[PDB]
Design a protein around this ligand. Structure first.
Ligand SMILES: OC[C@H]1O[C@@H](O)[C@H](O)[C@@H]1O
Ligand SMILES: OC[C@H]1O[C@@H](O)[C@H](O)[C@@H]1O
Ligand SMILES: OC[C@H]1O[C@@H](O)[C@H](O)[C@@H]1O
Ligand SMILES: OC[C@H]1O[C@@H](O)[C@H](O)[C@@H]1O
Ligand SMILES: OC[C@H]1O[C@@H](O)[C@H](O)[C@@H]1O
Ligand SMILES: OC[C@H]1O[C@@H](O)[C@H](O)[C@@H]1O
Ligand SMILES: [Mg+2]
Ligand SMILES: [Mg+2]
Ligand SMILES: [Mg+2]
Ligand SMILES: [Mg+2]
Ligand SMILES: [Mg+2]
Lengths: 396, 396, 396, 395, 395
């Protein structure tokens, strides 16, 4: 078969909007009518600019191609316009389209995507979630309340989650790395202490930092939270300096996790080689798609390192994560977001049950995308999927 | 003053089209009506998608801002959408806009841009050019003809050039690095031998490769051309592997030059640190603009390394290169392209004279852009500025 | 479907016998009657012991399993008996069985194997061959005759080959590395000189050493042959010391190729990481099979390195090489052996044509194995596929 | 003399089966009637296939050879079939045969094997044991019971042992390294705390992990057990990544020990060179035999590192360990397993006495193998000596 | 048996005295009357002081000991007086005594020494020699004559030698490394050119420098001789800086050989680890003896490096080299000196024949030492075995 048609749907999750301001869905159709769904993860520019980028990438490198030719299509986009180094925006476009190709391939083969990726390694995939406000928690105060976070952790654990994520360490800003305030450090310690007291040995603590810090700052914060045995320390520094992250990794006793803002094996390889991270967290809708991330997973294997696929986006990218995770021996866990809208968008096709995800057995990604629901929920705002503060860190 | 309006003009150089399929010009206007001109260098996606990207970057991060705030505007774009690592496409958009800001600043200050960048280091800037066919040379056979290249080289020296560039080493393809054919090596040797014979000591040879090669291939080719004392070996490998390039630099006795496909100090710093290149060749319309490249020039200084700004684009980016070059102690030379169209587009405001460029004394970039000429030459081709071949290297 | 039956056929090539004393072929049959062919490359012990080893591996880890589960089956064999490090014999057994699984998968999917491996990268694959005696050459004197080798090189070029391999450097012995005799060095120079004269730019020289040498000896030999621009220097030292090989790589101006005696990504990753080789030459019937070697090919990509699959065995392993090579962007060339028996054994299903190989379009490996022919050619000797002599290097 | 005959006996230890499902014994006879016994440690494939491998290795490289020629026979097998890099299965076959050659050599020389290896360094060799259930302990609950492990440790100390080993860190699986569960870490801390309280300064704690973990996971577990001063941290990661293990060694304050799944000096040298381990634990029946391990012991010397020969097998390999250990300056301790079957199989010829082993003075390995007993205890299972679980870690 | 008696004999080789001013022979006798011969290589102080050192070492650490206990006796001497780091003089004394122990052990075992060292690897051992004046060559002009050296080289080849050594690079002085004169480089080039022309492919050139040079000077000299493909570049810098030798190794395309002035595995291990030398040339009478060098040979194996035992001493140390070399898979070649005195002192027991040495089959070192001849040739001078001049390099 040959790829023929592209539809792009930008959809806005209802309030409180866990998973960001909008999700960029792509729907591909072959010349014989098979449809595949994918999801792009790219917000350097807004959704309208992303539409033009996606349409270009598809028309230029993919339209009329056999969807089997995943290596070739990656090379075309990766090399586009005499580049042949990672383009964060163009590869974001490609990744979503590549995921749709896998959905198509599974349907054409009559097999789930994982069955095409070296088969099943994992009959059940360990899941985790951020700590989100419970219904009685005021949303804004929740983010700096250790007490409320501990309640959310207790509820996650009751529900079967074996790991929970939180970031009490303060705002990320556009200036780059900063030194944490003493209050950021003490709050981070309070969170770890209270969450550990609430979950005991029943769950791991995932310290979900957002690249806020200088190397110096990341080390000072890291050392303070060591006594609570967090399973990982995520993005301790901004994503533009592998050497700086390896410095943090060598100086703190907590495993460093990173990858959500990185793209292609050309960026993941140095992270491993320099010892910057032990746990890789690519967003498949950003990092080059399923096949490219299989290449990265194999690289992680020879460093005795593991994958933990990123999710702060919709259930389509999450379905890609699940098939990917089902097929690799070095899976740690899959980030997950439980909301009515996430579930409804794929008609409950794949779910976290008792803290774990069972790989679907249906063909392709094993999802039924509610296209009507996505279209009934357009994005009207002027913001990006996520945004970085302009105001500096508060020391007063 | 504040940045107010943006106009984007995509212009096609007339046949034979030295400088690529199209140039992306940007024109900014302040709220007091000062106009500034810049040029973007970004072709992962085509002109129409780039229009949308540039509009987004301007409206989101720059509209309404004081043009003095160059550090701030860079931080905004660089961090946009929770990224804060180089985005080749978004920073390409910013870079052109940043150059227009400098044009505006120079006009507001009543000074040439170089005077705002630490003043004048270089009363004259050494230029170079590719070897282009002479009026009596057939175009297609020229590129693989050592005899014709040598004739072109003699002509360049007659007109005062002290350095000439050529790439006789074969096609660059989307597959990534390949091993050169024996004929690629022999042709490269023949070019270097005959061009050296033609120029003697009057000019340097610049071996202007396009990242065609595996590390192994780059070393085999490099050792073969060493006897002709080429001043530099440009992009010996693809731009997505700093360690690989450093392996070439250590294994060949020719200084390695690179950078036209890199962006921001976050990418240039590791190139220096690992010893991947001795000469840095940013395209200012790609790499973050003038101020960001001043940062890189300072970094090159503490490696006893030099800048050689890239030009395979229009005279507006070139003008930016000139002001940048004029203000740095560690300038090697400025890539230049002499066509009637280049000259006409800036109304002969800045020219190579006897192999050298005098920094302009007029305010701003010191150019008068022929906007009418640009608009009379629209681009409506289907191709990208430059493109990478799909067919493999030919060994037969 | 499920794997059900295994047949093992050990076949001896007739005269002149290029490709070793015997080939170990495996035939797998599923519960629904689909057949797949593979080939094991393992001769630490003889074919009778290997038959017992292959039976054990299949029954313990593979019988009853869905052939899709390539990741899982590799993990089972690789970890077998609380090992989980490379076992050369056990993995040799698995590799052939794994290749047969791929033949089955392609047949089940109705697609060529390469189509299941990320699709087609290479519509034509560059082949090479050893220099073999011409009909007018006495066989034994051929191996040390530079004059005859040159004739054979010209012959290969006339056949359309673009690279030729030869080893004039003397015997490999069980003692480990030795220093070459002055005669070994002079003969190697004479070979390179006369072969280069005979082929000019029409073909590459592949210096096909067999790990005879101490690090010191390999460097002395390497420097002597540099003037002839050999494309690679194969196994300059024994395969049991990555650091020693990297020392050679750094001290010689020729790219180092290795891998035929290595197994799994666990061994190939340090080779890349330490810069021991630029070109990886796994024997797929030894190194863990097709999928494991796709993992290695991906690792080679992030070192800007290439694959050149090894062949000193039958056409079944070669078929695996072809499908593997068809699917990777970083293919250099495929080692090939053109004998009447190789061709007859797969009924001319896949052939070298004018120095290149077209990937087959038929399902699975795209071969029709002549089982009757393999069975009519049993192995009756007491030797191993290849053997290392006991007598030392001859300096007198 | 010349090696002429090989006999292979696969024997199964009676329940509870401390030492694994089966032991592969080899018996070599020279042309003038001297017999030597050795033991192979190799289970990538089962005993049936191993018989075929052993027969091949012996017939091809050793039959008809003078047993003095240990360097040559090693080179022959190591290089077999144009290989000349470690083959886990072929070298496991060779190792047992090589041990048997040393038994023969000792007998022909009229000297204990240690006497031929540079002489006696160690009049008494420090022994250690795993913690095994006491008679009143239920077998299954014992492995996760810190209380019972502490009781067993106290008993070990009362019998003279100065070091004890235990692994409470959870299952090893075929998937490769995993992250420990919080309960794996807490249980490991509980074991270390209670065993340390039970033994005080009277014994060392040996944290006998089985390569279960990712580098990250091994560092998290390792840091938690540091306060109890464990003497070593064994196989913290799988045996297929020297760089990963070196990362653990640099990041935890406990000496790393490894080697039971490694083979030949070609694999032990990089471990030392990269600082992956401070203590080397080859299984002599796997790693290339006695002489190859003397080479490794010498390499360990120039890294100020020590040897601790592995034992999860029979008394024959153990006897090889003792002679090896007696002859080296850099011995730490010898792993030992005390069962009635181990003792009976070598007719009580060598024994742990009060936590230490005296090198025997009799010729060869100084053992009398009860061949009849070995033959009366055949292996009837379908499994391997040890096996790796398919199911993942339980969180 | 136990070591009981020590006799020291210092003997001077007659003019022209190839092999140095004197050789230090040691003779050990066991309590049951077995005799063993060894040779010490130690010249920091003269023969009389060395006598006192050897007597002390023997009486303190070895007398009354079973000669089997080679590991233990080395540890004793190595650690003597709270040292436990290489003492050139003390270990030089031990080394000769250790060689004598091996002679005794072989006699007691009824086997050649090589048979006790892992058996035979090499049925014949490749030999080499310095280029010595031919009978019609004037001795003094010979050392700086490329023409005469080439004649001697052609003669060596006619006699079956496959490698020849020479040093045209100038004097070694007590000052330490110096820069070669242009004439030193030119003469070295002339030597290499003319010797290569005389031997073609029939022999290797061994550039046998004596540590004359600074790192810079060694690199300038090394690059100039590269075109003639010398097999090795011996001791390019003084033996007291591993990092400096490694700098030469990385900067010249010739393999570096060293070790004659080094002692124990503690010094050879860093040489390998840092990549300072690819070929190791211990003098067994200096470096710790046969067993200690077997440890070093095993270390060389895991660096894919080789041994070339040093000889500028008597036939007793040479006998030790031969047995050592016979037993190791990684032998390159054995330095040899053919003089009437060498041959007579061991009664022609072991000889170079057609450029190769056959390991003896007789018990022990397989030599019959002419004790009477040794005593008939005492050393009468006041000098040292070799000496370093005080005058600087001549520019
Ligand atoms: O600048 C170096 C690059 O490496 C990666 O860590 C980041 O993507 C960054 O862009
Ligand atoms: O691939 C690693 C990064 O380094 C740079 O060389 C490339 O642009 C890439 O983004
Ligand atoms: O794969 C690398 C090797 O290092 C050693 O630790 C293992 O034996 C493995 O085979
Ligand atoms: O000896 C260590 C390993 O490195 C690799 O080069 C060989 O396969 C060997 O097994
Ligand atoms: O000079 C430092 C040490 O290194 C060795 O090379 C020398 O023997 C010396 O003792
Ligand atoms: O072992 C190498 C040398 O360095 C010093 O530490 C020792 O004394 C020894 O002589
Ligand atoms: Mg995150
Ligand atoms: Mg260029
Ligand atoms: Mg080969
Ligand atoms: Mg263990
Ligand atoms: Mg010397």
């Amino acid at each position: 078969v040959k790829l023929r048609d592209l539809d792009i749907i930008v959809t806005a999750p209802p309030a409180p909007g866990w998973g960001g301001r909008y999700w960029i869905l792509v729907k591909l159709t072959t010349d014989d009518g098979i449809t595949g769904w994918g999801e792009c993860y790219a917000a350097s520019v807004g959704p309208e600019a992303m539409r033009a980028v996606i349409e270009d990438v598809f028309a230029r490198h993919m339209e009329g191609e056999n969807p089997e030719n995943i290596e070739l299509m990656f090379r075309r986009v990766y090399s586009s316009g005499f580049t042949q180094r990672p383009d964060l925006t163009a590869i974001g476009a490609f990744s979503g389209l590549e995921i749709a190709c896998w959905d198509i391939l599974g349907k054409a083969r009559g097999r789930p995507v994982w069955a095409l990726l070296g088969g099943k390694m994992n009959p059940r995939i360990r899941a985790y979630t951020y700590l989100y406000p419970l219904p009685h928690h005021p949303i804004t105060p929740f983010w700096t309340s250790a007490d409320m976070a501990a309640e959310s952790a207790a509820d996650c654990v009751a529900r079967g989650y074996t790991a929970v994520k939180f970031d009490p360490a303060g705002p990320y800003t556009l200036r780059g790395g900063h030194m944490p305030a003493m209050t950021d450090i003490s709050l981070s310690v309070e969170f770890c202490r209270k969450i550990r007291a609430a979950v005991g040995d029943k769950a791991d603590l995932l310290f979900g930092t957002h690249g806020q810090f200088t190397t110096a700052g990341a080390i000072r914060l890291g050392q303070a939270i060591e006594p609570y045995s967090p399973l990982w320390y995520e993005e301790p520094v901004p994503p533009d300096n592998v050497g700086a992250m390896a410095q943090v990794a060598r100086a703190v006793r907590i495993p460093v996790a990173t990858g959500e803002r990185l793209t292609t094996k050309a960026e993941f390889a140095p992270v491993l080689r320099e010892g910057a991270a032990a746990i890789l967290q690519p967003a498949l809708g950003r990092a080059g798609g399923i096949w490219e991330m299989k290449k990265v997973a194999a690289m992680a294997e020879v460093y005795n390192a593991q994958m933990a696929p990123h999710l702060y986006a919709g259930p389509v990218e999450w379905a890609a994560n699940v098939h990917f995770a089902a097929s690799i021996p070095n899976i740690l866990m899959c980030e997950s977001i439980e909301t009515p809208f996430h579930d409804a968008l794929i008609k409950g096709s794949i779910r976290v049950e008792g803290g774990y995800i069972t790989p679907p057995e249906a063909p392709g990604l094993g999802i039924e995308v509610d296209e009507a629901l996505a279209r009934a929920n357009p994005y009207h705002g002027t913001g990006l999927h996520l945004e970085m503060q302009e105001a500096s860190c508060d020391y007063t």
